[PDB]
A paper describes a structure:
Photosystem I (PSI) is a multi-subunit pigment-protein supercomplex that plays a crucial role in the light-driven photosynthetic electron transport of oxygenic photosynthesis. In eukaryotes, the PSI supercomplex consists of a core complex and peripheral light-harvesting complexes (LHCs). The LHCs associated with the PSI core (LHCI) capture and transfer light energy to the core complex, which is composed of the reaction center P700 and core antennae. Symbiodinium are the photosynthetic endosymbionts for corals and play a vital role in supplying their coral hosts with photosynthetic products, forming the nutritional foundation for high-yield coral reef ecosystems.
Here, we determine the cryo-electron microscopy structure of Symbiodinium photosystem I (PSI) supercomplex with a PSI core composed of 13 subunits including 2 previously unidentified subunits, PsaT and PsaU, as well as 13 peridinin-Chl a/c-binding light-harvesting antenna proteins (AcpPCIs). Using single-particle cryo-EM, we solved the PSI–LHCI supercomplex structure at an overall resolution of 2.8 Å. Moreover, we assigned 196 Chl a, 20 Chl c, 41 diadinoxanthin (Ddx), 13 β-carotene, 16 dinoxanthin (Dx), 10 peridinin (Per), 2 phylloquinones, 3 Fe4S4 clusters, and 21 lipid molecules in the PSI–AcpPCI structure. Like diatom PSI, the Symbiodinium PSI lacks PsaK and PsaO but possesses the PsaR subunit, indicating its close evolutionary relationship with diatom PSI. Intriguingly, distinct from other reported PSI–LHCI structures, most of the PSI core subunits and half of the AcpPCI subunits possess extended terminal structures that span across both stromal and lumenal surfaces of the supercomplex. The extended termini of PsaI/J/L/M/R, along with the PsaT subunit, form a protective layer that encompasses the stromal surface of the PSI core, resulting in reduced interactions between the reaction center and molecules in the stroma. On the lumenal surface, the PsaU subunit spans across the edges of PsaA and PsaB without obstructing the binding sites for cytochrome c6 or plastocyanin. Since PsaK and PsaO are absent in the Symbiodinium PSI core, AcpPCI-3 and AcpPCI-4 occupy their positions and facilitate the binding of peripheral AcpPCIs, resembling diatom FCPI-3 and FCPI-43,4. PSI–AcpPCI lacks 10 Chls in PsaA (A1-A10), 10 Chls in PsaB (B2, B4-B7, B10-B14), 2 Cars in PsaA (ACar2, ACar4), and 3 Cars in PsaB (BCar1-3). However, the emergence of previously unidentified Chls in the PSI core and AcpPCIs, along with the conformational rotations and shifts of AcpPCIs and Chls, leads to the formation of specific EET pathways in Symbiodinium PSI–AcpPCI.
Numbering used by the authors:
A (entry chain m): 64 to 142
B (entry chain b): 336 to 438, 446 to 603
C (entry chain c): 76 to 161
D (entry chain y): 94 to 223
E (entry chain a): 1 to 221, 230 to 541, 556 to 687
F (entry chain f): 111 to 279
Write the structure that this text describes.
């Protein structure tokens, strides 16, 4: 390095550099696989946020909707 | 900086709450804290303005007195008010800590001098003026003597026209815009204080009583390595810092355009 | 487009109508005041938002209010000349 | 000892290099080994071009060059119109002698605040008119 | 003629001139409007005859003011100056006709100028002007002061008289042919001939004696005696470093003869292309048209003066008086910029009040092409600097625009003086030296062109779109100085010619600051300095010739010019000479920052704050019946602009003057 | 740890200036600079006499300030703001006199405004009445306390504009 700091030059502070890179190609690939999973989930989340709630679902969607018993208890308790 | 941003954010969102959330009672009714505050918002703002004016007048005047006397070469003529209250609090804290030790704390206690007193009063001025602007925006967001019907309009609107004498920067968002400059100033003052006392404790203690010390011993003196980073002689590891120093200067100057024209 | 509203405090002096740059306003018969007329805003689609009516209003606080709506800007309210949205 | 063996041994606070002096000795050895005083930029970019007397080197104004700029690239500027200075000195000395003879007496320094009678005044001199 | 109608009764009315101020003092806006419209004689009560009366009498009163200022300058030179010491030895003693009191330790401001004198070093070149004029005695300076005071009294009397001598029938001010002929033949031609006579008869003998070294009263109380056949300007006075005063006198005689000849050919109607200018003659017979044209003429002449006073040396020792030449250049450049923006303003006023010329009917192409040229100029010129910065930071000097790297040679910048090789020196200083142009000069000159073109763009847009535009079609009805037309149509802020000037002033200030920095750095690096020994000299310049190497980058400008050369002003507190300059540096920074308050904020916030404050006054029964009001929008803009320009100019003033004073002493 | 230490005199960060090495050095340096500046001019010069006067001023200033407290590190005289009246460089005396003068100015002014109650008088000052009020403002402390007590100073907030409307009417 060509240090430009007065304190660095005075005290001889150094930026030690390893001989070998910390992570290997396989480790970087695994991290990238996890990042890809994150990206897919994030795209799905962005789509959901963009489209918001769909109150029409009760007209065509399968099932009859459900409220968890704890959610019902919270509703009964109130705010 | 993050703390200052969050504080001004809390103020801005309180103003927005008043604009579009608070359900004000009828005028004569005074039952909630917000209504009680709105009853004497004028007194609040006038007293805050008085405090800000006092702090600014006296801090700037003492600094200018010291500046002129130092320029004429007579440090003995400087007004140097010893920080007796802060020193007493610090001595009590040190007494408690010493008792605990008898039963190290570094940087929790610092020498504290008249320069510290002046800088603390400057920072108090900054805080008081920022709060003045934000409180005025919040308490005039719903209505004002100049614009009584400000509830109907959005949180941020351009103006109300050149009539009624002119209505630039009449919205609560415009008060936030204005208080943002102050936040940046008061935060710059705080950061300059910390950085100067950190770099040169002794020089800060002896010379921080007049503004030329801040302008010369802190900015001009310590600006050398950054500007010298890259030149015709060569470059060093601070060249990136020197290019971002100038890029940001240019960004500031560009902001001047949208602010003025 | 902007929203130009008129309130009964109106005294029918016609200054808003005379100050209108794009003829958004017109006086209409009324019994609320002594002048027996109140300004109306039928052509609010042409309102540009200059608030000259508001400048010319005499009443203590304005009997005519122009609320700006930047989201609903139209070519008439923007005074577009070189480009046409019609 | 020496930088080579210092770096071969290495530094580790956790195990042996519990001495700040040893730590900074190793740091200085590493600095000397791996750091350079300057980036090594060509010295030419630092040398001046205009006003240093070396303008002709760059050939900036080759087509119809300006005569007033010296052609020499050594970096030295000759004095323009050197030949006139002796002539000017001779002219001014000759004029000094001519006026001295014309007056007939030695020149007397004028007084900034002094008052002098006009040579043609009809009244008796109070202060010498010269 | 009837002087019984001039009474002091109207002195206490304070607003009689403006009918809009009849309802006196209902608010503070009334005070501000009174001041703003005090001198707007066109919109004031009366008639066109009264407007002409006021214009002419005010011109005469200002003439008297200038004469008073000149008389004060002469008096200070005579009694409160070291002009005697400077005349005997100009080099050793710095000019100083300025002394400060010892009130609060303020005596520290006075600095050593001579053995028996201590004061403030002046930078106006008045000592050199006196020396050129031949003024070498306190009696002569005293009589010059007396003449200036008598002229002041005469001009004051003339203004007072003409306020009543001129009646509604008066028309002498509309006789443009007579006015121009008289000014061209008498004021200029005869004036120049008479001044050539003055030089030949008074200054030439005195200046020749001073150059020789003679200081004899009898001598102080044969043209071309010492001037050789060398072309004027090609040979400077070896003992003074300036053009021969006999050559100057011959110049003035020739100029007067030329002016008289021009006037006589105009009198005889020899000029034939009257039709090409007849349209302008008919259109521009207006107060504001003439004011704009004259302001532009004097701005250009001031810029030419700024350049020539330095490049071409004519005053004795002003060439080596580095603070003097620098201050003269900077002052006259600033005046050029201010009067140019003034010309733009009054062009806009003329367009508003009168019918414009037909070039306004294709204004869209004009301003469109000016916008394009401004954008292209700025892009290329400033992006060369940005490219240099980025590449040099990345570590690739070979990729930058500089003399060693890619070079932009100014091929068109060619000599015309044809001077001999070498430089001219006088007592350890470089009186004259050729400026060598390269990539840095190319870049800085194109920056100059860019800034000039943008300022011109703002002024021309204000002038051409004053009457109406696509946005607002009744700008003529709105007038000249209005804040806006409303938040409508997107927002019509600063659509008025007044606001166009308000921005053109910022841009003129930016242009002039860059010009001042260019001149200062180039002169310090490549022209001024000392020399160390057919003889060849190595020239040691004050800035060490760093302009050509460092000026190619904005970082170089920031470091080698502002930071590096602010050492004198920034470290001036202890020094008796320039402690005032350091304090003014600080205070100008403060004022410039304080201007941003008005430049960024708006009326409504301050009005609401004022009302909240006034609540407490009303509570305590302090009721001001001149109801406090926030400054109008246009006034806030004006205050911000004034403080901004004043602070910037003060910082530059203190910085450059401190540097020059310290370096030369 | 003692009531005696409450006084600013008994503090470890301050010392008497006459016994402060930094204070002595600073003044010695100021005197040296002034003398060096003086030496440039001729002995019998008016500027020489002025510099002698300035040197005398500096010496008298040093003698006067020797009694005041100043920090050990920098040795510059300090201003006591605790509230101790009987201490050199006390802030109370200037504070009290300024407060009296400022109250005088405010009272005078308020009294003129109350007496006139007219924008015309505000613009064209009734100089006799203005001078009368300026002279009368000397008893402002007693007059102001009496008016505050008797209710002639402040008016109920219902008599003045409160501000903008924050609710529906
Ligand atoms: C150096 C620049 C500068 C200065 C001197 C001031 C001064 C002031 N501002 Mg600030 N202000 C600035 C820049 C500056 N501003 C900028 C850039 C903005 C952004 C637009 C603002 C926006 C702003 C707002 C919105 C408000 C202030 C207020 C104030 C006052 C604070 C109290 C005070 O110090 O009183 C002492 C006075 C001085 C130090 C001025 C000098 C007086 C003489 C010379 C001594 C004062 C008049 C507040 C106010 O009015 O409080 C009453 C307020 O509400 N300012
Ligand atoms: C451009 C005009 C001009 C300017 C800027 C100045 C400026 C100055 N003159 Mg003045 N002066 C002028 C014209 C001018 N003069 C003229 C025309 C004459 C007579 C021909 C004089 C004769 C004169 C003398 C004899 C002296 C000055 C002095 C001064 C300085 C101090 C003034 C002072 O203490 O005022 C004090 C403040 C006032 C008078 C208040 C003015 C307003 C109230 C209402 C009166 C100051 C630098 C003094 C100086 O330099 O001392 C070292 C000094 O002794 N001047
Ligand atoms: C009481 C203050 C005072 C007074 C009365 C004068 C008076 C004079 N000075 Mg000035 N001067 C002052 C302070 C003062 N000066 C200070 C503090 C300095 C710094 C050491 C100087 C340095 C100085 C020099 C070097 C020269 C003068 C000269 C003059 C004469 C010029 C005429 C004139 O002013 O025209 C009116 C001119 C103006 C109103 C100029 C307005 C615009 C200026 C140039 C803007 C520049 C920045 C500004 C100074 C500061 C802005 C920031 C600030 C608000 C904090 C006159 C005798 C000249 C002379 O010939 O003297 C015999 C001369 O050469 N003065
Ligand atoms: C810009 C300078 C200027 C100009 C253009 C004029 C123009 C005029 N003056 Mg003059 N005047 C001036 C300066 C000037 N004055 C000054 C400084 C004074 C004060 C001494 C006077 C005092 C004065 C008087 C007292 C009279 C004139 C008159 C005149 C008229 C010229 C007739 C004459 O006698 O011409 C020959 C020269 C004309 C309106 C006369 C006039 O209008 O008569 C009808 C007249 O009576 N002027
Ligand atoms: C006889 C010679 C003579 C002389 C010396 C002058 C001199 C002058 N005249 Mg002119 N004038 C003359 C004859 C003369 N006039 C005649 C015969 C007439 C016809 C009656 C006029 C009519 C006339 C008018 C109507 C006006 C002048 C003005 C002026 C002044 C303009 C200077 C100026 O703006 O500089 C500019 C320099 C810089 C910007 C720097 C100047 C003092 C103007 C003025 O303001 O006078 C007070 C003006 O308005 N003159
Ligand atoms: C008697 C003849 C004469 C003399 C001796 C001078 C002398 C001078 N003139 Mg010139 N001048 C003259 C006639 C004369 N002029 C005429 C008739 C006009 C037209 C009105 C001008 C217009 C004029 C202007 C506009 C300027 C000068 C300037 C100068 C000065 C510098 C010129 C120089 O260095 O040129 C160098 C010489 C040459 C390039 C040789 C060419 C000569 C001819 C063309 C062959 C000098 C004092 C300048 C000045 O005052 O600077 C401070 C200046 O700006 N003159
Ligand atoms: C540094 C501050 C700054 C900057 C950058 C500008 C820039 C500009 N102003 Mg100015 N202006 C300023 C301050 C500034 N102003 C202030 C404070 C004011 C208030 C008084 C004004 C008031 C004002 C007015 C009233 C006008 C201008 C005009 C202009 C334009 C001039 C022409 C042009 O664009 O050419 C040069 C452009 C530049 C130098 C911009 C930077 C270009 C760089 C070097 C190259 C870009 C490289 C690359 C493509 C970037 C990609 C980034 C991306 C990948 C992220 C330009 C946009 C005029 C205009 O618009 O005319 C057409 C105009 O009328 N300005
Ligand atoms: C919140 C801060 C604060 C406040 C409000 C006061 C208030 C007071 N102090 Mg101070 N004081 C402070 C901090 C403060 N002090 C600190 C931190 C110290 C420690 C150094 C002191 C040490 C101190 C002393 C030693 C004395 C005061 C005195 C006083 C009185 C001054 C007015 C007076 O004379 O009234 C009474 C009217 C006469 C008053 C009771 C003086 C006092 O009471 O004098 C009588 C006094 O002797 N104070
Ligand atoms: C289809 C069908 C049938 C079938 C079938 C049959 C027999 C199918 C068999 C399928 C088979 C045998 C499929 C293997 C997949 C292996 C995978 C995906 C491995 C990935 C491994 C990965 C992604 C690992 C990656 C890394 O971690 C590694 C290793 C190193 C780290 O540094 C990091 C990385 C990221 C680099 C029936 C049942 C017969 C009838 C039915 O009717 C229809
Ligand atoms: C002692 C001391 C201290 C402390 C102090 C304090 C803490 C104080 C307080 C104070 C306060 C806490 C006060 C209160 C107040 C209140 C009120 C409520 C008031 C009111 C007022 C009024 C009402 C007025 C009126 C008037 C007058 C009287 C005059 C002028 C005019 C007028 C009208 C303005 C210190 C440390 C600082 C310093 C040292 C000493
Ligand atoms: C601060 C400010 C105000 C408020 C400022 C006001 C009302 C100015 C105050 C005027 C005073 C009373 C004039 C007296 C002069 C000064 C008090 C002098 C001080 C001098 C020192 C050296 C002591 C506006 O009204 C305004 C309007 C439009 C755009 C920007 C602004 C703006 O920035």
């Amino acid at each position: 390095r060509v240090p430009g700091g007065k304190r660095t030059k005075e005290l001889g502070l150094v930026v030690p550099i390893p001989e070998e890179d910390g992570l290997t190609d396989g480790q970087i690939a695994a991290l990238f696989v996890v990042a890809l999973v994150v990206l897919i989930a994030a795209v799905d989340l962005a789509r959901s946020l963009y489209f918001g709630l769909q109150p029409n679902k009760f007209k065509t969607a399968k099932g009859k909707g459900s409220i968890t018993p704890f959610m019902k208890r919270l509703i009964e308790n109130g705010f | 900086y993050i703390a200052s941003f969050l504080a001004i954010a809390s103020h801005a969102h309180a103003a927005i709450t008043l604009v579009r959330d608070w359900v004000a009672p009828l005028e004569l009714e005074s039952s909630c804290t917000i209504a009680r505050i709105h009853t004497h918002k004028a007194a609040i703002i006038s007293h805050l303005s008085w405090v800000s004016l006092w702090l600014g007048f006296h801090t700037l005047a003492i600094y200018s007195h010291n500046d002129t006397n130092m320029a004429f070469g007579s440090p003995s003529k400087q007004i140097l008010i010893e920080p007796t209250n802060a020193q007493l609090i610090q001595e009590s804290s040190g007494k408690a800590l010493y008792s605990f030790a008898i039963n190290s704390f570094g940087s929790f206690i610092y020498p504290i001098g008249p320069g510290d007193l002046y800088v603390h009063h400057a920072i108090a001025l900054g805080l008081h003026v920022t709060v003045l602007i934000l409180l005025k925006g919040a308490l005039e967001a719903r209505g004002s003597k100049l614009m009584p019907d400000k509830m109907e309009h959005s949180f941020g609107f351009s103006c109300d026209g050149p009539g009624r004498g002119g209505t630039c920067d009449i919205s609560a968002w415009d008060c936030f815009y204005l208080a943002m400059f102050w936040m940046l100033n008061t935060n710059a003052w705080i950061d300059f204080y910390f950085h100067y006392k950190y770099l040169a404790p002794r020089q800060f203690s002896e010379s921080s009583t007049y503004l030329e010390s801040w302008f010369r011993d802190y900015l001009w003196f310590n600006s050398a390595p950054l500007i010298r980073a890259y030149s015709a002689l060569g470059t060093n590891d601070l060249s990136v810092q020197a290019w971002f120093f100038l890029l940001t200067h240019l960004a500031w100057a560009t902001g001047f355009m949208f602010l003025i024209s | 487009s902007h929203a130009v509203k008129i309130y009964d405090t109106c005294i029918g002096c016609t200054l808003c109508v005379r100050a209108c740059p794009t003829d958004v306003l017109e006086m209409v018969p009324a019994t609320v005041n002594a002048a027996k007329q109140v300004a109306s805003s039928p052509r609010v689609e042409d309102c540009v938002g200059c608030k000259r009516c508001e400048t010319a209003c005499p009443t203590d606080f304005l009997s005519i209010r122009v609320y700006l709506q930047e989201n609903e800007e139209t070519q008439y309210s923007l005074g577009l000349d070189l480009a046409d949205w019609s | 000892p020496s930088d080579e063996e210092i770096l071969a041994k290495g530094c580790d606070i956790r195990v042996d290099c519990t001495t700040k002096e040893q730590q900074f000795a190793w740091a200085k050895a590493y600095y000397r080994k791996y750091n350079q005083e300057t980036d090594g930029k060509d010295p030419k970019y630092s040398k001046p071009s205009t006003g240093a007397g070396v303008f002709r080197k760059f050939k900036i104004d080759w087509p119809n060059p300006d005569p007033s700029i010296p052609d020499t690239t050594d970096g030295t500027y000759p004095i323009r119109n050197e030949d006139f200075l002796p002539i000017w000195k001779q002219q001014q000395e000759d004029l000094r002698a001519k006026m001295k003879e014309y007056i007939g007496r030695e020149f007397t320094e004028i007084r900034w605040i002094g008052d002098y009678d006009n040579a043609r005044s009809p009244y008796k001199p109070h202060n010498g008119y010269y | 003629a009837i002087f019984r109608y001039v009474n002091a009764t109207l002195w206490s009315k304070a607003g009689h001139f403006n009918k809009a101020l009849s309802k006196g003092a209902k608010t503070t806006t009334w005070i501000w409007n009174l001041h703003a419209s005090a001198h707007d004689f066109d919109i004031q009560q009366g008639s066109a005859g009264l407007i002409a009366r006021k214009v002419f009498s005010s011109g005469l009163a200002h003439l008297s003011l200038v004469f008073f200022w000149l008389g004060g300058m002469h008096f200070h030179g005579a009694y409160l100056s070291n002009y005697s010491a400077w005349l005997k030895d100009p080099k050793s003693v710095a000019p100083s006709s300025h002394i400060a009191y010892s009130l609060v330790g303020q005596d520290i401001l006075n600095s050593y100028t001579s053995q028996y004198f201590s004061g403030i070093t002046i930078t106006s070149g008045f000592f050199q002007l006196y020396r050129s004029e031949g003024i070498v005695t306190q009696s002569q300076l005293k009589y010059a002061c007396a003449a200036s005071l008598i002229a002041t009294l005469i001009c004051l009397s003339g203004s007072y008289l003409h306020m009543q001598l001129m009646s509604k029938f008066t028309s002498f001010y509309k006789k443009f042919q007579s006015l121009s002929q008289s000014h061209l033949i008498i004021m200029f031609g005869f004036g120049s001939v008479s001044f050539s006579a003055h030089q030949i008869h008074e200054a030439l003998p005195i200046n020749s004696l001073l150059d020789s070294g003679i200081w004899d009263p009898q001598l102080f109380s044969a043209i071309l005696l010492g001037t050789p056949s060398a072309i004027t300007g090609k040979l400077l006075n070896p003992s003074t470093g300036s053009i021969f005063l006999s050559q100057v006198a011959a110049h003035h005689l020739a100029v007067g003869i030329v002016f008289i000849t021009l006037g006589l050919i105009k009198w005889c109607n020899l000029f034939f292309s009257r039709n090409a200018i007849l349209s302008l003659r008919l259109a521009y017979m207006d107060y504001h048209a003439q004011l704009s044209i004259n302001l532009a003429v004097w701005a250009s002449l001031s810029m030419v003066a700024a350049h020539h006073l330095t490049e071409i040396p004519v005053y004795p020792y002003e060439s080596t008086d580095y603070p003097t030449v620098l201050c003269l250049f900077v002052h006259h450049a600033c005046l050029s910029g201010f009067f140019t923006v003034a010309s733009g303003a009054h062009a806009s006023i003329f367009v508003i009040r009168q019918l414009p010329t037909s070039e306004i009917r294709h204004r869209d192409p004009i301003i469109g092409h000016l916008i394009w040229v401004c954008i292209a100029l700025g892009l290329h010129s400033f992006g060369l600097y940005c490219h240099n910065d980025t590449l040099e930071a990345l570590g690739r000097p070979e990729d930058t625009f500089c003399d060693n790297s890619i070079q932009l040679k100014p091929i068109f910048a060619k000599q015309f003086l044809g001077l001999q090789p070498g430089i001219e020196v006088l007592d350890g200083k470089i009186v004259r030296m050729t400026q060598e142009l390269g990539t840095a000069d190319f870049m800085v000159h194109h920056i100059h062109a860019f800034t000039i073109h943008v300022t011109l763009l703002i002024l021309l847009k204000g002038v051409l779109y004053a009457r109406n535009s696509r946005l607002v079609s009744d700008k003529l009805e709105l007038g000249f100085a209005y804040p806006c037309d409303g938040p409508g149509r997107g927002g019509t802020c600063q659509i008025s010619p007044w606001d166009h000037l308000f921005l053109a002033v910022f841009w003129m200030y930016n242009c002039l600051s860059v010009v001042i920095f260019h001149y200062f750095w180039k002169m310090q690096s490549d022209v001024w300095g000392s020399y160390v020994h057919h003889s060849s000299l190595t020239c040691s310049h004050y800035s060490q010739g760093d302009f050509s190497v460092n000026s190619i980058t904005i970082n170089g400008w920031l470091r080698n010019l502002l930071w590096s050369e602010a050492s004198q002003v920034i470290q001036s507190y202890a020094l008796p000479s320039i402690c005032s300059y350091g304090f003014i540096f600080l205070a100008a920074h403060f004022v410039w920052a304080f201007s941003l308050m008005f430049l960024f904020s708006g009326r409504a916030y301050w009005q609401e704050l004022i009302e909240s404050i006034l609540w407490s006054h009303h509570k305590l029964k302090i009721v001001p019946h001149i109801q406090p009001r926030a400054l109008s929008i246009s006034q806030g803009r004006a205050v911000g602009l004034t403080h901004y320009v004043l602070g910037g100019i003060g910082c530059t003033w203190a910085f450059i003057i401190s540097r020059m004073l310290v370096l030369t002493t | 740890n003692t009531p005696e230490h409450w006084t600013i005199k008994a503090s470890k960060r301050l010392e008497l200036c006459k016994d402060n090495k930094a204070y002595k050095k600073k003044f010695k340096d100021e005197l040296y600079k002034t003398e060096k500046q003086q030496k440039k001019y001729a002995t019998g010069s008016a500027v020489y006499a002025r510099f002698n006067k300035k040197i005398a001023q500096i010496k008298n200033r040093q003698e006067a300030y020797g009694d005041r407290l100043c920090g050990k590190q920098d040795g510059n005289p300090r201003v006591v703001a605790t509230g101790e009246w009987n201490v050199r460089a006390s802030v109370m005396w200037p504070a009290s006199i300024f407060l009296y003068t400022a109250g005088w100015i405010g009272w005078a002014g308020r009294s003129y405004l109350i007496r006139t109650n007219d924008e015309t008088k505000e613009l064209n000052i009734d100089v006799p009445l203005a001078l009368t009020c300026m002279a009368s403002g000397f008893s402002w402390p007693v007059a102001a306390w009496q008016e505050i007590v008797n209710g002639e100073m402040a008016v109920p907030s219902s008599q003045i504009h409160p501000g903008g409307p924050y609710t529906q009417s």
